[PDB]
Enzyme design. Structure first.
Site, mmCIF file in Angstrom:
data_model
loop_
_atom_site.group_PDB
_atom_site.id
_atom_site.type_symbol
_atom_site.label_atom_id
_atom_site.label_comp_id
_atom_site.label_asym_id
_atom_site.label_seq_id
_atom_site.Cartn_x
_atom_site.Cartn_y
_atom_site.Cartn_z
ATOM 1 N N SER A 27 60.805 77.715 -7.810
ATOM 2 C CA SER A 27 62.145 78.204 -8.056
ATOM 3 C C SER A 27 62.139 79.370 -8.973
ATOM 4 C CB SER A 27 63.014 77.098 -8.612
ATOM 5 O OG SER A 27 63.507 76.335 -7.519
ATOM 6 N N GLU A 74 92.030 67.534 -10.861
ATOM 7 C CA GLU A 74 93.211 67.722 -11.690
ATOM 8 C C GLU A 74 93.358 66.720 -12.800
ATOM 9 O OE1 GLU A 74 97.361 66.540 -10.110
ATOM 10 O OE2 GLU A 74 96.042 66.110 -8.314
ATOM 11 N N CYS A 126 62.226 71.772 -5.559
ATOM 12 C CA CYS A 126 63.604 71.788 -5.095
ATOM 13 C C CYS A 126 63.743 71.914 -3.578
ATOM 14 C CB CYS A 126 64.326 72.966 -5.723
ATOM 15 S SG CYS A 126 66.174 73.063 -5.763
ATOM 16 N N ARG A 135 62.752 49.487 -16.518
ATOM 17 C CA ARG A 135 62.108 49.082 -17.754
ATOM 18 C C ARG A 135 63.192 48.776 -18.774
ATOM 19 N NH1 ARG A 135 57.533 49.811 -20.457
ATOM 20 N NH2 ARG A 135 56.817 51.695 -19.293
ATOM 21 N N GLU A 158 69.399 58.310 -7.472
ATOM 22 C CA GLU A 158 69.889 59.027 -6.292
ATOM 23 C C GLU A 158 69.206 58.567 -4.962
ATOM 24 O OE1 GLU A 158 68.730 62.965 -7.422
ATOM 25 O OE2 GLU A 158 70.720 63.496 -8.241
ATOM 26 N N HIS A 204 97.274 70.058 -6.851
ATOM 27 C CA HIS A 204 97.574 68.721 -6.400
ATOM 28 C C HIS A 204 97.539 68.602 -4.899
ATOM 29 C CE1 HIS A 204 100.066 64.878 -7.192
ATOM 30 N NE2 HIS A 204 99.990 64.958 -5.875
ATOM 31 N N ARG A 259 57.792 62.665 -14.557
ATOM 32 C CA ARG A 259 56.992 63.671 -13.875
ATOM 33 C C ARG A 259 56.197 64.440 -14.943
ATOM 34 N NH1 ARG A 259 59.010 64.752 -10.276
ATOM 35 N NH2 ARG A 259 58.273 66.746 -9.317
ATOM 36 N N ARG A 263 68.111 57.593 -19.211
ATOM 37 C CA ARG A 263 67.922 57.823 -20.657
ATOM 38 C C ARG A 263 68.132 59.286 -20.906
ATOM 39 N NH1 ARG A 263 65.728 55.400 -25.048
ATOM 40 N NH2 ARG A 263 64.718 53.598 -24.012
ATOM 41 N N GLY A 264 68.917 59.589 -21.939
ATOM 42 C CA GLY A 264 69.236 60.981 -22.230
ATOM 43 C C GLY A 264 70.657 61.384 -21.795
ATOM 44 N N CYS A 314 65.978 68.886 -4.780
ATOM 45 C CA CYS A 314 67.404 69.163 -4.564
ATOM 46 C C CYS A 314 67.806 69.157 -3.128
ATOM 47 C CB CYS A 314 67.768 70.537 -4.989
ATOM 48 S SG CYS A 314 66.992 71.272 -6.425
ATOM 49 N N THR A 348 66.584 73.644 -11.354
ATOM 50 C CA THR A 348 66.375 74.882 -10.615
ATOM 51 C C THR A 348 67.248 76.073 -11.041
ATOM 52 O OG1 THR A 348 65.705 73.577 -8.799
ATOM 53 C CG2 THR A 348 66.205 75.830 -8.336
ATOM 54 N N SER A 367 65.533 56.694 -13.359
ATOM 55 C CA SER A 367 65.797 58.120 -13.490
ATOM 56 C C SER A 367 66.866 58.584 -12.505
ATOM 57 C CB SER A 367 64.551 58.889 -13.141
ATOM 58 O OG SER A 367 64.309 58.714 -11.741
ATOM 59 N N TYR A 368 67.313 59.814 -12.669
ATOM 60 C CA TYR A 368 68.265 60.299 -11.746
ATOM 61 C C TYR A 368 67.575 60.231 -10.416
ATOM 62 C CZ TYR A 368 66.477 65.286 -11.288
ATOM 63 O OH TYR A 368 65.870 66.454 -10.895
ATOM 64 N N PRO A 398 66.274 68.392 -0.126
ATOM 65 C CA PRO A 398 66.019 67.123 0.603
ATOM 66 C C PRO A 398 66.890 65.990 0.037
ATOM 67 C CG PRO A 398 64.021 68.277 -0.124
ATOM 68 C CD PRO A 398 65.105 68.788 -0.937
ATOM 69 N N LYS A 399 66.876 65.834 -1.283
ATOM 70 C CA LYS A 399 67.678 64.858 -1.975
ATOM 71 C C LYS A 399 69.152 64.950 -1.550
ATOM 72 C CE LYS A 399 69.791 65.841 -5.571
ATOM 73 N NZ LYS A 399 70.050 65.582 -7.076
#
Ligand SMILES: Cc1cc2nc3c(=O)[nH]c(=O)nc-3n(C[C@H](O)[C@H](O)[C@H](O)COP(=O)(O)OP(=O)(O)OC[C@H]3O[C@@H](n4cnc5c(N)ncnc54)[C@H](O)[C@@H]3O)c2cc1C
Ligand SMILES: Cc1cc2nc3c(=O)[nH]c(=O)nc-3n(C[C@H](O)[C@H](O)[C@H](O)COP(=O)(O)OP(=O)(O)OC[C@H]3O[C@@H](n4cnc5c(N)ncnc54)[C@H](O)[C@@H]3O)c2cc1C
Lengths: 490, 485
Positions: free
Chosen positions: A13, A468, A50, A212, A195, A463, A284, A217-218, A55, A334, A190-191, A57-58
């Protein structure tokens, strides 16, 4: 004098980004990118994480999972659809890959056209201003350049337990895996874990998650728990405080059957289950340990792996820069790496003086119920300013598109964190609900201009749009009032 | 001194009910009058307002059905084994839609009840100073008095004034409850309402045609508008430019029937005819301010148009009568704005607030097959305020990642922002045409309330892969003249 003006190790990236941006100002540039296979032996093209295992593929698979529901909503809106539709994994994967392919070939051309040299090879430093490029067949080659860019990025981290590398798959293997992973197990919180656990479940696969400790976390922990709670309520199974200790092939196949043994984190208990697949998503590791960083003088953080750098993306060695996930204490996303690489090339060869800002970066974790946020978490924020100078406005909300199908009401949720010492400045934004990414972008832009609560109120909302809800937030956390419908249906 | 109520609201609508509640919250005696005069075809609806009953809600919701159709086709390439074409049962949709509005109807009812506000399902008309005449449904009347009044009656669909309309044509009011697949439809008009409806109607399969007097979305960024049409034209909808109907004849009645529509061009004297199953009119809405007795109390309205002039405090020329909403002169005709005005008034009035409702730079979205949300100045109106030399326009195309796999409409979506060069390249106009357009815009509108600038925007990092991010890296301008394909 030297072979090239700039050499970029890693066609990722931020890699390809700086590449093109540097090429744009008439410099001689060479990007070397090589993808070391995965234990199970998976490979992919030019582009980066990514594009090939991240990103792109995910998010796409998340789509197939969202479309799933859309098929189920479509019913009440009057479409005559079957009660249960089936999903063809092999058809999906294929499609996804077909796109990544185009992305691959695209980037290739992209470099060609901008007069940049691409070398499909692994690069390592051998000595000052010199690098060793090794191709796939083994044939080496040396090049030299006035300056160097390290954009190698990281890779999925394994457990170090019996059976992993040998039977478990990682985010790299998944987006190309060629078989209904069937009952799966996701080790990690993890995310990426969430996901993935996320879309797999959404395709119908039996899914379990081993955690775990805490979730995300974070991240704002409150928001996290809510994601989990939603995850649990819509099919995903969770086992808390358990790390596996061994993975044993009870049979091979596409897929096979596997036995996973695990040891609780607070007792001597041990459990066992058999699943068809097991993907690890527990972290990672930066790919900075095998490139020659000693033969050139780069001090990294041997402990963690990241590279310390300056607000110009400069290492300790003046002609060697690094941008991307590999940096120490930054943001592993990315769009960030790309801004860094772009901005650098400018700072360097265009006279720019603009430094890539890493403060208040928006994000979106694509869980079944998306969740985007920007700015401080609730916790981090309180900590920085003190519970008395921070106020939190929050509320729930129900997407108009969810009323007819009549599902999940009082499940989406929003909240902003304000610093009462600074004109109730919006220091943190947090939204959990559909299309959360789209909803967040702009508010991030707002933070770059110092949005305030008065200013937010002054805004009129669109609306009927989910987004909103932020224009009308009257309830504070500290006031202690309640937030629910005087109807309670969904 | 001494009256029946502390505050009377004529109109139980978006801003109506908004003000009702906010005022009741500060311990005032309030009464809300709301009455729905039937449509010529005889349709009626519950408490709530246009939004809830014949507007936003029903509109968006049906948009959703239209969008889910697409989702049903996209789902294919992602791996879901679905049929090549799925059928849609109108009756069933309409029903769902109606079942939700109800809950909304009754919700508001209760909402008032608990907030200790009085509501009468009656037509309100001023008879004299601080006095109003509430006629109910069976005709019985009654008189009330209040130390202050609030006008929130809003508008209603306008008709052509040609033979056959009120008698054979339907309007937005009639649509969202129509009890029969409208069949081959014709939508007269080029307003958001027009296109929006034409849009979903076309989206669930119906043969749709649109007749336009002149341009599309007059008032909107004409460039953005054209793209919306060109897109609508591209996905089914049929258009007829420069033609207004002159008469609608019934070829046969039924559910639905057949009708002939005779139209005259505007550039010539040519005349065409066609027969459609239904004919909907979306040519404008007329404020309901003509029949409430505004003479008897001293209210001056602009008899020309219909709107009501008011101060920056939503006050009329009569100190004890205020108005909020669609019926205001030169303002903004959207629900959120009316609700703000009502809320903020109550506060400015009974809570010592001093906050005015700001009508500058108000976000909005038009839910046509291809959403389009915008905030601030259009390009035209922008140039016209600062001058072609001081305005720079950055714009890009973009393709939603979710569209790739199904493989469709690439280079259709489009972004764009207008900056005032003479002012730190400030962002004066935001325009986006793509899915989830509303979601994307909201926040940027909030950015404007803080004076976002192109430098600041550039310093923002995008979200990947999100449609919205396109605004975080816009390099091309219209003036430089490069391409974007
Ligand atoms: C499953 C998953 C989902 C993600 N989803 C998102 C998302 O939705 N949104 C988002 O913003 N971010 C996401 N990310 C993070 C994103 O992929 C990274 O932040 C981004 O790709 C990093 O850019 P980079 O150039 O620094 O590293 P990379 O993109 O990984 O580029 C690194 C490239 O350099 C090559 N390389 C490494 N070493 C050498 C060497 N010695 N010689 C030659 N070449 C080498 C590698 O093979 C690799 O292809 C996701 C990550 C994962 C794992
Ligand atoms: C098809 C359509 C789609 C729309 N979509 C959107 C959208 O997506 N987003 C958006 O922001 N806005 C939208 N609008 C506009 C929105 O409906 C209005 O801006 C909003 O409803 C106005 O609030 P209001 O209280 O001033 O008028 P209203 O909501 O119409 O309130 C008026 C009420 O007062 C009652 N009344 C009138 N006269 C009397 C009387 N004399 N006595 C007693 N009661 C009376 C009426 O019956 C009516 O129910 C849309 C409008 C239409 C027609």
């Amino acid at each position: 004098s030297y072979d090239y003006d700039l050499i970029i190790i890693g066609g990722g990236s931020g890699g390809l980004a700086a590449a093109k941006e540097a090429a744009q100002y008439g410099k001689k540039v060479m990007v070397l990118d090589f993808v070391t296979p995965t234990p199970l032996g998976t490979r992919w093209g030019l582009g980066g994480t990514c594009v090939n295992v991240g990103c792109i593929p995910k998010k796409l698979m998340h789509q197939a999972a969202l479309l799933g529901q859309a098929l189920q909503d479509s019913r009440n809106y009057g479409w005559k659809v079957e009660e249960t539709v089936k999903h063809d994994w092999d058809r999906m994967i294929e499609a996804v890959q077909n796109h990544i392919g185009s992305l691959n070939w695209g980037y290739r051309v992209a470099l060609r056209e901008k007069k940049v040299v691409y070398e499909n090879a692994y690069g390592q430093f051998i000595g000052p201003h010199r690098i060793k490029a090794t191709n796939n067949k083994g044939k080496e080659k040396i090049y030299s350049a006035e300056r160097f860019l390290i954009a190698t990025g990281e890779r999925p981290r394994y457990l170090g337990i019996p059976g992993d590398k040998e039977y478990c798959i990682s985010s790299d293997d998944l987006f190309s895996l060629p078989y209904c992973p069937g009952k799966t197990l996701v080790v990690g919180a993890s995310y990426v874990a969430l996901e993935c656990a996320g879309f797999l479940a959404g395709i119908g696969l039996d899914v379990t998650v081993m955690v775990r400790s805490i979730l995300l976390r974070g991240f704002d922990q409150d928001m996290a728990n809510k994601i989990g709670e939603h995850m649990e309520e819509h099919g995903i199974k969770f086992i808390r405080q358990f790390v596996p200790i061994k993975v044993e092939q009870i049979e091979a196949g596409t897929p096979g059957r596997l036995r996973v043994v695990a040891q609780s984190t607070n007792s001597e208990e041990i459990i066992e289950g058999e699943y068809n697949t097991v993907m690890l998503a527990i972290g990672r590791d930066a790919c900075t340990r095998k490139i020659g960083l000693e033969t050139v003088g780069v001090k990294i953080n041997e402990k963690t792996g990241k590279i310390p750098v300056t607000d110009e993306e400069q290492t300790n060695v003046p002609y060697i820069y690094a941008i991307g996930d590999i940096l120490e204490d930054k943001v592993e996303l990315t769009p960030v790496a790309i801004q860094a690489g772009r901005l650098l090339a400018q700072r360097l060869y265009a006279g720019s003086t603009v430094k890539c800002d890493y403060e208040n970066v928006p994000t979106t974790v694509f869980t079944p119920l998306e969740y985007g946020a920007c700015g401080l978490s609730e916790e981090k924020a309180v900590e920085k300013f003190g519970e008395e100078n921070i106020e939190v406005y929050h509320s729930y909300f129900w997407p108009l598109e969810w009323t007819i199908p009549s599902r999940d009401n009082n499940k989406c949720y929003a909240k902003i964190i304000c610093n009462t010492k600074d004109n109730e400045r919006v220091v943190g934004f947090h939204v959990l609900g559909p299309n959360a990414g789209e909803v967040t972008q702009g508010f991030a832009a707002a933070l770059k201009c110092g949005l305030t609560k008065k200013q937010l109120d002054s805004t009129i909302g669109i609306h009927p749009v989910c987004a909103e809800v932020f224009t009308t937030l009257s309830v504070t956390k500290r006031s202690g009032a309640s937030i629910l419908q005087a109807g309670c249906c969904g």
